[PDB]
Structures are given as C-alpha cells and as structure tokens.
Design a protein around this ligand. Structure first.
Ligand SMILES: Nc1ncnc2c1ncn2[C@@H]1O[C@H](CSCC[C@H](N)C(=O)O)[C@@H](O)[C@H]1O
Lengths: 227, 6
C-alpha cells in the first residue's frame, strides 16, 4: 500500500522542520545550490514558467495583475530575478534561510531594488498580507511542509490574493504515494495527493502542466495555477 | 529541487 499522507511518513514534526533548516543552512547560496546540482536546467525551467504564467496575463475579465508577486521559498531569488522582477512592479520574497536572503541582495543586482519585503520565516509560520499579491509563486518548497501546514498555508495565500490573482505551485511529483527524503527532510507527493490538498484549501485548478525537457533520472515536475 | 528518483 502506498502512503497517502505525511502523517504516515514523518516520525516527528519538530525534527522534520529542524532537520530541513539545518540542511539548507549548509547549502551554498548559488543557483546550483538552489537546484540540487542541476543549476544547468535553470533556463529550461524559467522559460516554461514564463509561458505558463503568461496564459494568465492576457487582457480580458480575469487578467492577473502585474503590481506585486510573492516568491515563496525564494532562496537567493533565482525565480525573482529571471521570471518575476521583469513582469511585476514589486516582488516580496520569503525563505527560511537568512543567508540566502542576504545573498539575494547581491544576486539580484540593480533590479533587486524593486524587491520590497525580504521575509525570513518558514512558510508554516508566515501569514501574507490580505489583498496584496497578483501572483504567489511556490516552487520547490511544498515538500518541506506537512499536509496540514501546506493546506493552511494555501488558505492564507488565498486570502492574500488581489482580484484575479493566482497561486502557482511548481514541484516534483511522485509517481505514487508520499515519499520521504530523510537526508534533506522533505517529501515528494503524487498528483492525487497534491490535488487533494489544493481542494482542501478551498482552491481550484485553472491549469496543470508537466515540465518538458528534463533529465530522465529525476522526479517529474508539474505546475499548477490556482485560485 | 530537481532530484533523482529514489
Ligand atoms: N519551511 C520552509 N519555509 C520557507 N522556506 C523554506 C522552508 N524549507 C526550505 N525552505 C527554502 O526552500 C528553498 C528550496 S530551494 C528552491 C529555491 C527557489 N524556489 C528556486 O526554485 O530557485 C531554499 O531556499 C530553502 O531555504
């Protein structure tokens, strides 16, 4: 029987979070650090993210705005730099690892002057301001939250969207079940599990897309656009 | 992050 929830795989919630914080504290503040040695795929990723996002920026009644985005688990700001700052007037970043947010000030360069808030906080402890963001971007971090905390964080994100705003989750997906990585202290969930959590947060899918052109050996990656 | 299937 596959496991269907984090409650079947996490021995100790406090250790699940503390071990992950210790893991990221020892990763270099570089794109290759953010991407687990796959820094070279960054451009494939950003190009696909941009095309996925631009779906929602078309003129019409539901056009997503371009005033402010939130980059969740932003790290040094790879996505903030290459995807979000060029499209949004301001961007906020949230990440648990202070040293990454410090490095971001260098990494982002001149355009980083349009980063407004640098929040050093776990997502599980973060309440974004109501009615603040056009796009909330959550990439390669949801596996660091328990199911309960991910559901709650998505509920708080829903409350922080502007009119026509969206949440985007982009992450690894397991073929089946819920799989623990005890080295970095994270989980990989199958598409049914992720969809269950999104539904439980009172969100609906606008779109779902598999990332193409990835190395054959890694977990498949999907993007979801939600409101 | 991009990760090898365990
Ligand atoms: N509970 C948590 N809350 C917030 N950030 C977390 C977290 N657990 C891990 N992180 C952060 O999640 C990031 C994962 S690496 C990916 C960084 C970025 N999303 C990108 O795609 O380039 C790291 O910066 C790490 O510090």
């Amino acid at each position: 029987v596959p496991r269907g929830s984090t409650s079947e795989v996490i021995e100790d919630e406090k250790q699940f979070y503390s071990k992950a914080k210790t893991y990221w504290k020892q990763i270099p503040p570089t794109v290759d650090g953010m991407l687990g040695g796959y820094g070279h795929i960054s451009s494939i990723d950003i190009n696909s993210s941009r095309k996925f996002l631009q779906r929602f920026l078309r003129e019409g009644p539901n056009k997503t705005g371009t005033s402010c985005a939130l980059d969740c688990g932003a790290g040094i700001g790879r996505i903030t730099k290459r995807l979000l700052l060029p499209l949004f007037r301001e961007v906020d970043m949230v990440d648990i690892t202070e040293d990454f947010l410090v490095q971001a000030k260098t990494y982002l360069g001149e355009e980083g002057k349009r980063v407004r808030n640098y929040f050093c906080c776990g997502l599980q402890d973060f309440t974004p301001e109501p009615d603040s963001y056009d796009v909330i971007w959550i990439q390669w971090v949801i596996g660091h939250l328990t199911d309960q905390h991910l559901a709650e964080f998505l509920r708080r994100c829903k409350g922080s969207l502007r009119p026509n705003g969206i949440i985007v989750i982009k992450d690894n997906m397991a073929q089946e079940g819920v799989i623990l990585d005890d080295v970095d202290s994270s989980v990989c969930r199958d598409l049914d599990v992720v969809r269950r959590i999104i539904c439980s947060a009172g969100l609906s899918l606008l779109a779902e897309e598999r990332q193409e052109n990835l190395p054959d050996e890694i977990y498949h990656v999907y993007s979801f656009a939600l409101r | 992050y991009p990760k090898r299937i365990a």
